[PDB]
Amino acid sequence: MQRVTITLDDDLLETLDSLSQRRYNNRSEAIRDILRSALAQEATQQHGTQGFAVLSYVYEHEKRDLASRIVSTQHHHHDLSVATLHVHINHDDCLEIAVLKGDMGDVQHFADDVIAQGVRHGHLQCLPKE
Amino acid sequence: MQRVTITLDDDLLETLDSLSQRRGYNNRSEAIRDILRSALAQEATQQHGTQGFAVLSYVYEHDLSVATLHVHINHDDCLEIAVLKGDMGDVQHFADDVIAQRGVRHGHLQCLPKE
Amino acid sequence: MQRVTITLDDDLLETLDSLSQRRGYNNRSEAIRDILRSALAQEATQHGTQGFAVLSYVYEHHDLSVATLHVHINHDDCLEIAVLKGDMGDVQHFADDVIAQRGVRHGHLQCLPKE
Amino acid sequence: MQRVTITLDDDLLETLDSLSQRRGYNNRSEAIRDILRSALAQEATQQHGTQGFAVLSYVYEHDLSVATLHVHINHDDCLEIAVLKGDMGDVQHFADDVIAQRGVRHGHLQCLPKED
């Protein structure tokens, strides 16, 4: 265990202390619990296992730059793709849902590129073969 | 913004760093800040007034519905992805009622309330 | 280049002229000449041949399915769009099977053989 | 009825005559008329002022959109299926516009006007 120092916006810290009354004791324990529950679903998929995955995110299809960026890595790694669903959620935003399949290690590596590239609300739900 | 000191065990810091490698987080701080903010939106309850969209996905052997995608993930299991639109409160209640029914596994709900 | 003289009904020609406007067909000849060439293609790509197909229909263990999309077009009716893959032969059969079923209306199968 | 004359290349007529043996077309006219009648049944002009849905699909390498599905049918081509809702005239107009774009092959529009 190590003692770390993080810097959080005044807003988040306020939203946090708020939740700290519906559930804590002190920020440390509040932050610890949330962080732990959130990471539980973020384990590293190991190269070797097969399965599927649901990658969802939002982006403005109003920007040709991001649009071409998200569209390029998609086609270039079409091997993982099973089908992608698109839905305009407002005049500028497109909600994209991509069903991926293959090596879970590759699926997660691929999804993480997207989630980090104008992409917002990106979520990856890994579904390892069972 | 403030600076806060917290103690995290070696098992967790490992996932956090493991996760930071993947998403390209510069520092633990931006990581935790993103994970925190993001986690506070998924757990909080959607007030039965604000509108938006949501993605409901789950595996198994109507007004809030924009479209649902079904895919066979083996001979027995079916992955179903429902894009939902409406009262974020109705959306979530309907989701939660689905995610706990009979043989519904890996249920997940991602809410996208209006900007 | 040969000349073929065909007697065609007035009503039919009205629809062809309408289609020509929407497409830019300079004259009937270019129009017929094009519809024809496209139909004969759908006819050469009829078993043994692999590809994709789009099966859609409104509705109140062998699976050539890649994914199916469902959209509620009203309280009572649902639009189903299945993307099929595999042998165009088995694909056409699966499709006929689906279309005969009770309830199913407006069935259409669009084949897309390996091109 | 009108007597229409059209010029067809020898290749197509060869393919046409062959197809005619399998289908029972007793001459080029019957062949042409029937292929033509069946193809125009799916191409009536949609009128503005009427509502409904539509499925637009094609291959590639007013918010009429409800949802679009994309599938990779090979390493280069993409099958795209768009569920459209709105004025049928605009839907069709839009589809013809998509179908006219270079790069778009196998375009097909299935119109589902409001039922009852």
Q: For chain A, how big is the Rg over CA atoms in Å? A: 18
Is C78 assigned to a binding site? yes
> Over the range C38-56, which residues count as b (16 or more CB within 10 Å of their CB) and which as e?
ebbeeeeeeeeeebbbbbb
Q: By what technique were these coordinates determined?
A: X-ray
What are the residues of chain D with a beta carbon less than 8 Å away from any beta carbon of chain B?
Answer: 66-67, 69, 83
**What six digits make up the tokens of D38?**
């069946």
Q: How many CB atoms neighbour CB A49 within 10 A?
A: 14
Q: If we measure between CA atoms, which residue out of B28, B113, B20 comes closest to residue A121?
A: B113
- The secondary element (H helix, E strand) that includes residue A34 is helix A27-39
Q: What is the resolution of this structure in A?
A: 2.3
Interface-testing mutation among D73, D108, D109, with chain C (most C C-beta atoms within 10 A): D73
Count of alpha carbons within 13 Å of D22, Cβ hemisphere only?
8
Q: Least CB-CB distance to B40: which of A19, A44, A125?
A: A19
Can you tell me the distance from the alpha carbon of D17 to that of A109, in angstroms, rounded to the nearest whole number? 55
Q: How big is the A-D interface in CB pairs under 8 Å?
A: 24
All structural domains of chain C, each given as residue ranges with its CATH number in brackets, are 1-46 (1.10.1220.10), 47-115 (3.30.70.1150)
Q: What is the CA radius of gyration of chain B?
A: 18
Q: How far apart are alpha carbons A55 and A114 in whole angstroms?
A: 9
- DSSP secondary structure letters along B43-107: HSPPPTT-EEEEEEEEEE---SEEEEEEEESSSS-EEEEEEEEEEHHHHHHHHHHHTTSTT-EEE
Q: Is C93 annotated as a binding residue?
A: no
Residue for token pair 């590759």: A106
Q: Which residues of C touch B62 (CB under 8 A)?
A: 72, 75
Rounded Cα distance between A87 and B67, Å, is: 9
Please answer yes or no on whether B83 and D69 come within 8 Å at the CB atom. Answer: no
Q: Give the C-alpha distances (Å, rounded to integers) separating D101 from B58, B78, C2, D66, D105.
A: 38, 36, 31, 21, 9
Query: Which residues are paired to A105 by β-bridges?
Result: none
User: Which chains does D contact via 3+ CB–CB distances below 8 A?
Assistant: A, B, C
Residue B5 with chain A: CB contacts under 8 Å: 3-5
